Structure formats: C-alpha cells, structure tokens
Design a protein around this ligand. Structure first.
Ligand SMILES: *[C@@H]1O[C@H](CO[C@@H]2O[C@@H](C)[C@@H](O)[C@@H](O)[C@@H]2O)[C@@H](O[C@@H]2O[C@H](CO)[C@@H](O[C@@H]3O[C@H](CO[C@H]4O[C@H](CO)[C@@H](O)[C@H](O)[C@@H]4O)[C@@H](O)[C@H](O[C@H]4O[C@H](CO)[C@@H](O)[C@H](O)[C@@H]4O)[C@@H]3O)[C@H](O)[C@H]2NC(C)=O)[C@H](O)[C@H]1NC(C)=O
Ligand SMILES: *[C@@H]1O[C@H](CO)[C@@H](O[C@@H]2O[C@H](CO)[C@@H](O)[C@H](O)[C@H]2NC(C)=O)[C@H](O)[C@H]1NC(C)=O
Ligand SMILES: *[C@@H]1O[C@H](CO)[C@@H](O[C@@H]2O[C@H](CO)[C@@H](O)[C@H](O)[C@H]2NC(C)=O)[C@H](O)[C@H]1NC(C)=O
Ligand SMILES: *[C@@H]1O[C@H](CO)[C@@H](O[C@@H]2O[C@H](CO)[C@@H](O)[C@H](O)[C@H]2NC(C)=O)[C@H](O)[C@H]1NC(C)=O
Ligand SMILES: *[C@@H]1O[C@H](CO)[C@@H](O[C@@H]2O[C@H](CO)[C@@H](O)[C@H](O)[C@H]2NC(C)=O)[C@H](O)[C@H]1NC(C)=O
Ligand SMILES: *[C@@H]1O[C@H](CO)[C@@H](O)[C@H](O)[C@H]1NC(C)=O
Ligand SMILES: *[C@@H]1O[C@H](CO)[C@@H](O)[C@H](O)[C@H]1NC(C)=O
Ligand SMILES: *[C@@H]1O[C@H](CO)[C@@H](O)[C@H](O)[C@H]1NC(C)=O
Lengths: 48, 215, 226, 74, 49
C-alpha cells in the first residue's frame, strides 16, 4: 500500500513490471458516520 | 460481429462487497478470483486486438478529394458526411437499428466509434481512388472508371464491357446502393447478428446479477 | 539487383531477431500462459478451502476417520474444482492453438507449397513465395513479398481511337509522358509503342468515356511497303 | 496535472496536443507513454494523414520496386 | 467472436483491399469489390458482385 507502483508489484507477485495498463485495486470511499435508527417506543417489553 | 462488450468484474466485491468477514473467508479459496479476474482481462484485451486487426489494416489515413467525378458512380451515401461525427449516411442507420453497483463494469473500447469511422473512411478512400494497390504498397490513385475495367478483367469479362456500358452500370450501382438504404431503413431484422451478440451478453450479465438473490 | 535485395533482406531478419526478443512474443506467451496455468494449479494445494489444514497427511494424523472424512471431503471438492477449472482452461486454449495450427497448416499449404493470391495472407504486398523455419512449439515464416517503391504521375485515358474504332489494352493500361501515348503493364512502369499486337478493337469512339485520339502502329504495313 | 478522459479521471499524466502511436492503451482513444522525463497521455494517432491526388485522368504507376522479407510467427 | 473477427479481418483483407476469387466468399456471384461500413460491435460489408 505504499504507492501505486508498489501495488502493482504486490499484485503481479514480482519485483519487475512491464509496460502496460494494470488493473490492481478498487477505489472505495469510506463511511464517515454511523447512523442507527429505530422507531421511538418507550414501552419496556413485558417478558416478565 | 467483431468485438464483445468489454465486461470487467471485481471478484471480491461481487462476492463479498463491503465485508471484511466475507473477504477473509474468500481468501481460503486461494487464487480463484485472481484467475477469474485475469481471464476476463484476457478477453478484454483481445477485443481491442480484434478491432485493431479488422479495421486498422491500412497505415495512412487517406481522404477523398472534393472532386466526386467517379464517372457516374455515386458514393455520397457511403462516404463520410462532413456536415455531422463524420459518419456516412448508411452508417447512421446501422447505429440506430441496434440497442451495476455489484462490480459489473464495462470498460470503454480503445478505438472509439468516431475513431473507427476514420479507418472506414480511409479503406473506402483507398478503395475508390487507389484500387487494391494501397494494401500492397504505396497507394496509387486510379481513375475509377479505370478500376472497374480491372475488376471486370478480374472475373473473365473483357474491359470493353464496362466502358460500352459505363452509364448503365453506374445507374445500376447507384440504384443498388439505394435499395440497401430501404432494406436497412425498413427492418431491424437485417442486423440480427450484431443484435444477437449484445442480447446474449446482456442476458449473461442479467443472469449473473440475479444469482445474487439465491440462497 | 533482385539477388542483392533478397540477400540483404535475409540479413536484416537476423538483426531484428537477434536484437528484439519481443519479436517472438506469441510463442513466449504460449509458454508463459501454460506456466501460469500450472503454477496456479500447483498453488491451490496450499489452500484450506475451509478445511482445518491444507496438508492432507496432517488431517489424517490428527483426526479419526469419522471426522477427518468431513475435512478431507472439503479439500477434495476444492482441488477437484481446481482441476475442473484448469482442464477447462486448457481445452479452450487448446482450440485457440488448434485454429492457429490449422491456419499455420494452411499457410504452409498455400503460401509455402504455392503462391497465394490472397492479399495480406502472405505478408504485406503481392506475394512471391515463403520459407518455414522451426521454432519452439511453433513455426516462423519468412514471406518474400513484392512491394513497389517509386512512382511517377502520368496522364491516362481508358481507350484510344485510331480510325474511329475504340482500342483497349490487351493487358496493361494506357499512359502518356505528355507528348506521346504509351501502354504499360500495371505494376511496373515499362512503356511500349502502342500497336495492334498490344491492343484489341471493340466498338467505336462515340460510346467510350474519356477516349482520346492517338496513332496505333501496324507492324504489317512496313513489311508490305518494303 | 489532472486529465479528464472518457474512461475516467487520469492522474499523474500531462495531456499533450500532439499525436503519436499508441504505446500503452488507456481507453477512449487515449494512449500514454513515457517520454522526455514524464508520463504523457494523448489522443492516439491513426498514422500520418495522407490525401491522394485523385482525378479523372491521372495514373500512378510504379517505376521501381523492392523485395522485402516479413517475419510472421504462429 | 474471435474466429468471426479473423474471418472479418480476412474478408476486409482479400475482399476490400483486393478482389477475391473465392466463389461465395464475397457474396453470391463473381466478386467485384466491397466497401466496409462501421457498426456497433461489428462490421458490415457491401459486396458489389
Ligand atoms: C422475572 O423475575 C425476576 C425476579 O424479579 C422479580 O420479578 C419480576 C417480575 C419483577 O417484578 C422484579 O421487580 C421482581 O423483583 C427478575 O429478576 C429481576 O430483574 C430486575 C431487572 O433486571 C433486577 O433489578 C436490578 O436491580 C439491580 C440492583 O442491584 C442491587 O441490589 C441487588 C439486590 O439483590 C443486589 O444483589 C446487587 O448487588 C445490587 O446491590 C440494578 O442494578 C439493575 O440495573 C438497573 O436498575 C436500577 C434501578 O432498578 C438502576 O438504578 C441501576 O443503575 C441499573 O441501571 C436492575 O434494576 C432484579 O434484581 C432481578 N431480581 C433478582 C432477584 O435478581 C427478572 O428480570 C424478571 N423478568 C425476566 C426474567 O424476563
Ligand atoms: C448521390 O445520391 C444522393 C442521394 O442518393 C444525391 O443527393 C440528392 O440530391 C438531390 C438533388 O439532385 C436532392 O433532391 C436529394 O434530396 C438528395 N438526397 C440526399 C439523400 O441528400 C446526390 O446528389 C447524388 N450525387 C451524384 C453525384 O449523383
Ligand atoms: C516521351 O517519351 C518519348 C519516347 O518515345 C520521347 O521522345 C524521344 O525523345 C528522345 C530525346 O531527344 C529523342 O531522341 C527521340 O527521337 C524521341 N522519340 C520520338 C519518337 O520522337 C519524348 O521526348 C518524351 N517526352 C516527355 C515529355 O517525356
Ligand atoms: C479525333 O480526330 C477526329 C478527326 O479525324 C475528330 O473528329 C472531329 O470531330 C469534331 C467534333 O464532332 C467534328 O466537328 C470534326 O468535323 C471532326 N473531324 C473531321 C475531319 O470530320 C475527333 O473529334 C478527334 N477526337 C477527339 C477526342 O479529339
Ligand atoms: C531501383 O531501386 C534500387 C534500390 O531500391 C536501385 O539500386 C541502387 O542503385 C544505386 C545507383 O544510384 C546504387 O548505387 C545502389 O547500390 C543500388 N542499390 C542496391 C541495393 O543495389 C536501382 O538503381 C533503382 N533502379 C531504377 C531503375 O530506378
Ligand atoms: C502527383 O501529383 C500530386 C499532386 O499533388 C503530388 O502530390 C504527387 O506527389 C505526385 N506524384 C509523384 C510521384 O510525384
Ligand atoms: C475530367 O474532368 C474535367 C472537369 O474538371 C473534364 O473537363 C474532363 O473532360 C474530364 N475528363 C475525363 C476523361 O473524364
Ligand atoms: C493545445 O493548444 C490549445 C491552443 O490552441 C490550448 O488551449 C491547449 O491548452 C493545448 N493543450 C495542450 C495539452 O497543450
């Protein structure tokens, strides 16, 4: 994960890479918040 | 058909999209997906090689002169239309008779449709002005009324058949082209073969997507 | 000259081959792909496939048959699935070679054993003849092709009138150098005086488009006068 | 130093106005190469354009030839 | 597709850049010439016979 050259070496399982275009990874935006929602009930459930 | 839609698939996110717990379990299956992702890559490159070999048979991009004095032969429906993508009239009909978040991406082709039309302009440009010679060497301009008289000389028909019938043959060829337009214009069943390639690929991916719903 | 051109032509093949290792990319790809196939095939043996270990002997040492058979089954369906993929890969790849061989078998049938007239079947240019040369897992051809080199513009006309009859070239096309009209073969400028033995008569001037006036020599008249 | 192409957002490459032969394909007719040094991306050439001096009364007949030898591998 | 491409590549090689003498290769009849026309994911020929 050092740099996009290092990625190519890691994917090709080699320390030398030729001319060309290499598909190596997948850009993915990471999540930034956590959203937890449930309908507001205040009734304690009567398992008792 | 010449090329397939250059489909590309991501192994992990198709199978375990946004899941660390699932990607680890996939790793115990070794190099399976690296193989799959490789094979589809091998197809993808070959597609551009296919298009490269079919069209890019000529070294220099030729252009027809403004003079259209082809002894009566009317190409204006197959030569590129300068007033539009520089595509011929008959080309447009062909384009018009033919018709996601799970890692199923499409890579764009190397030679784009505008690019292709330049090749098919040259091959047509060399064919009309130069005959066969532009394939074997330096393109030699030949008067078109001459060139038929070689082609007729090529099927055991004496030259003097052409020139003595130059006017008629021109009309027949000119009229011949027109009926192609009507044939193409009327029915979309003319282009079944190309349509078949897309539909199969659409089904293949369409089937591929639906399998995500199975238990 | 044709001798020297062919000899020198042969020599350049050495240098292109001697210097450029990528001139033989195709064959090298065949080996590399197969080498990749086997290596992947070998490596799968290290995969656990969900089994407690990827070393078959380890399971049998550690587990009694009632349980090990479950783990062993996991490896079996995996590795067997791996051969399935590899064997399948070979078959398609084999057919790809199979078309190549048949195409190769073809090219030696027409192009080597004869003189193909399919343009661009035997390398760029009008084809002459060719030689095969062996190679690892493949063959290499040295197509000898005729490519014209130097051009000159000339003014042409599809026919000429002598006595109002239309004359056409028996083989070749008409040209002029500006003052005199010449017939020449199609792929190498070689003029000759236009005479009755070069041309055949058909129709008359009033139909041909672009016909031009000229003088056609008769070999026989000087013999009669003499 | 960012180039937007139909295939996506290309980072790290200079865009060049000139055309050359394709060295690394990219997509959408864009081909890249390493040239003097940096990585450049450009609209790939289809070759040198060559009009033909067509007319209705002109003929172009070779006066000299070559014999070439082409290597083809299968 | 791959085989079809070569057949296409072949056809444009002999039948466009030249005049093929293979009967029923450039359409029914004695072949004269052909013109390619592009098409989505394929090629279309107009064999003039
Ligand atoms: C089924 O019955 C179980 C028996 O309880 C009786 O029956 C039910 C029906 C109720 O009516 C109940 O009120 C009856 O007493 C029942 O188990 C009981 O569950 C509740 C809730 O979980 C427990 O209450 C908890 O109390 C502790 C207090 O702990 C201190 O006191 C105890 C006394 O024994 C000491 O042992 C401890 O060490 C502590 O010193 C609370 O800490 C705890 O958490 C929260 O509650 C208080 C306010 O109540 C808050 O202030 C705290 O900060 C916490 O936020 C519970 O409140 C009760 O102890 C437990 N009974 C016994 C005997 O342990 C069960 O819940 C019923 N329902 C089921 C099983 O579904
Ligand atoms: C070649 O054919 C095209 C159409 O087949 C001709 O364009 C037509 O020209 C006439 C005028 O004579 C117009 O009335 C039509 O509307 C045109 N049709 C189209 C589709 O543009 C063109 O003139 C012909 N050229 C030659 C040299 O014969
Ligand atoms: C065209 O070619 C002819 C060859 O037939 C040239 O005519 C000859 O020119 C030489 C040079 O002085 C004379 O010695 C010959 O007597 C000419 N032949 C005849 C039959 O007159 C002619 O000069 C060339 N013209 C051009 C413009 O190239
Ligand atoms: C070839 O030469 C003949 C003469 O032998 C030309 O015939 C002349 O044609 C014009 C046009 O109709 C007539 O007005 C003359 O009367 C014709 N000449 C004679 C002597 O009758 C003929 O035109 C020439 N061909 C070309 C293409 O120039
Ligand atoms: C045709 O071209 C060949 C080369 O392609 C010419 O051969 C050369 O001729 C020159 C004379 O000026 C010699 O010095 C060279 O040694 C020749 N080359 C070889 C390889 O032998 C030839 O002269 C040309 N012929 C014509 C008629 O133009
Ligand atoms: C013939 O004339 C055209 C006119 O532009 C020119 O481009 C071409 O080079 C000429 N051919 C030769 C062999 O000089
Ligand atoms: C060629 O076209 C010109 C028009 O520019 C015309 O004057 C001449 O007669 C034509 N010649 C032939 C042989 O078609
Ligand atoms: C190409 O030249 C134009 C000026 O005509 C300029 O606006 C553009 O930025 C240039 N592009 C490159 C890549 O140099």
């Amino acid at each position: 994960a050092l740099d996009p050259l290092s990625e190519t070496k890691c994917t090709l399982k080699s320390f030398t890479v030729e001319k060309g275009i290499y598909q190596t990874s997948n850009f993915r935006v990471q999540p930034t918040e956590s959203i937890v929602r449930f309908p507001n009930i205040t009734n304690l459930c009567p398992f008792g | 058909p010449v090329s397939m839609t250059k489909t590309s698939v991501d192994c992990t996110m198709y199978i375990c999209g946004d899941s660390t717990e699932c990607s680890n379990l996939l790793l115990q299956y070794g190099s399976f997906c690296t193989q799959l992702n490789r094979a589809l890559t091998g197809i993808a490159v070959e597609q551009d090689k296919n298009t490269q070999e079919v069209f890019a048979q000529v070294k220099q991009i030729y252009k027809t002169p403004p003079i259209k004095d082809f002894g009566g032969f009317n190409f204006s429906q197959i030569l590129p239309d300068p007033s539009k993508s520089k595509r011929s009239f008959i080309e447009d009909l062909l384009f018009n008779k033919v018709t996601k978040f799970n890692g199923l991406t499409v890579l764009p082709p190397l030679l784009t449709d505008e690019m292709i039309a330049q090749y098919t302009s040259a091959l047509l440009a060399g064919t009309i002005t130069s005959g066969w010679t532009f394939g074997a060497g330096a393109a030699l301009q030949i008067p078109f009324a001459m060139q038929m008289a070689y082609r007729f000389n090529g099927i055991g028909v004496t030259q003097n058949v052409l020139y003595e019938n130059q006017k008629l043959i021109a009309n027949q060829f000119n009229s011949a082209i027109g009926k192609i337009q009507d044939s193409l214009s009327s029915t979309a069943s003319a282009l079944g073969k190309l349509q078949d390639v897309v539909n199969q690929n659409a089904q293949a991916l369409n089937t591929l997507v639906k399998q995500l719903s199975s238990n | 000259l044709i001798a020297n051109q062919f000899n020198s032509a042969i020599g350049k093949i050495q240098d292109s081959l001697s210097s450029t290792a990528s001139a033989l990319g195709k064959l090298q790809d065949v080996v590399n792909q197969n080498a990749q196939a086997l290596n992947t095939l070998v490596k799968q043996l290290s995969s656990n496939f969900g089994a407690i270990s990827s070393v078959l002997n380890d399971i049998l040492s550690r587990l009694d048959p009632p349980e090990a058979e479950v783990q062993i089954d996991r490896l079996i369906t995996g590795r067997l699935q791996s051969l399935q993929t590899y064997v399948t890969q070979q078959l398609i790849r084999a057919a790809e070679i199979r078309a190549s061989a048949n195409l190769a078998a073809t090219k030696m049938s027409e192009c080597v054993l004869g003189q193909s007239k399919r343009v661009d079947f035997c390398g760029k240019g009008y084809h002459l003849m060719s030689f095969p040369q062996s190679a690892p897992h493949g063959v290499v051809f040295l197509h000898v092709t005729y490519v014209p080199a130097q051009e000159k513009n000339f003014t042409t006309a599809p026919a000429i009138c002598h006595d109002g009859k239309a004359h056409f070239p028996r083989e070749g096309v008409f040209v002029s150098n500006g003052t005199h009209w010449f017939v020449t073969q199609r792929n190498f400028y070689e003029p000759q005086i236009i005479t009755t033995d070069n041309t055949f008569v058909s129709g008359n001037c009033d139909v041909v488009i672009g016909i031009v006036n000229n003088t056609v020599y008769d070999p026989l008249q000087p013999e009669l006068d003499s | 130093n960012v180039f937007q192409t139909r295939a996506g957002c290309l980072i790290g490459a200079e865009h060049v106005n000139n055309s050359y032969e394709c060295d690394i394909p990219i997509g959408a007719g864009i081909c890249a190469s390493y040239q003097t040094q940096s990585i450049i991306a450009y609209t790939m050439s289809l070759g040198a354009e060559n009009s033909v001096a067509y007319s209705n009364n002109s003929i172009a007949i070779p006066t000299n030839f070559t014999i070439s030898v082409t290597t083809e591998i299968l």
